[PDB]
Design a protein around this nucleic acid. Structure first.
Ligand SMILES: [Zn+2]
Ligand SMILES: [Zn+2]
Ligand SMILES: [Zn+2]
Ligand SMILES: [Zn+2]
Lengths: 76, 77
DNA sequence: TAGAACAGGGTGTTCT
DNA sequence: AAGAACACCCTGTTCT
C-alpha cells in the first residue's frame, strides 16, 4: 500500500512485473496492444504524476517500460 | 494566410479574433467559459500542433491567449 | 493479479 | 462568424 513506480499515485499491487497504480496497469496493457506510436510535445522528459500522467502517454509509456513493465511477466 | 495561429492545422476562419481552425475555436470557447486549471507536464512550451495539441491544454490555452483570442472579439467591431 | 466493462471527460466535426 | 450537439476516444474505477 505504497506508491506507483510510474506516476507515484497509490500502488494497488504488482502488475505486469511492477508495483503500479490501477490506472497505470490498464494504460500499459492498452499501449502495448494498441501499438500506438505516441509523440511527446516537450523533451521526452515530462513529469508523470497523478495529475499530469494523462498529458503525455509517450513519456508515461516510456516510464512504464523503464520500470520494467511487461505483459509476459507472470509467465516468468 | 490560411493556417491556424494556435496549432498550424488548416484555419477555417477568423474566430474570437484570430485565424484558427475549428478545433482551436471550440477549445478556446470551452476553456474561457469554464475552468482552465490545466497543468503543463513540460516547461510551458509544449509543441502545439495537429498531432500534439491534445497533449497539453495548459500550453494550447496559453497559445490561444498569446495569439489574441477573446470572446468579445465580435462585439469589439 | 489480470481483465472486462462502464461511466465520465475532453475533442473535433457536422449542423439532412 | 458563433454555438449546440453528437460521436469518438481516452482514462480510471468497479467488478470478475
Ligand atoms: Zn501510476
Ligand atoms: Zn512527454
Ligand atoms: Zn488550431
Ligand atoms: Zn505544456
Amino acid at each position: 500500500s505504497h506508491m506507483c513506480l510510474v506516476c507515484s499515485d497509490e500502488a494497488s499491487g504488482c502488475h505486469y512485473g511492477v508495483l503500479t497504480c490501477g490506472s497505470c496497469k490498464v494504460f500499459f496493457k492498452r499501449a502495448v496492444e494498441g501499438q500506438h506510436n505516441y509523440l511527446c510535445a516537450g523533451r521526452n522528459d515530462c513529469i508523470i504524476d497523478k495529475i499530469r500522467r494523462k498529458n503525455c502517454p509517450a513519456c508515461r509509456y516510456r516510464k512504464c517500460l523503464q520500470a520494467g513493465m511487461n505483459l509476459e511477466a507472470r509467465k516468468t
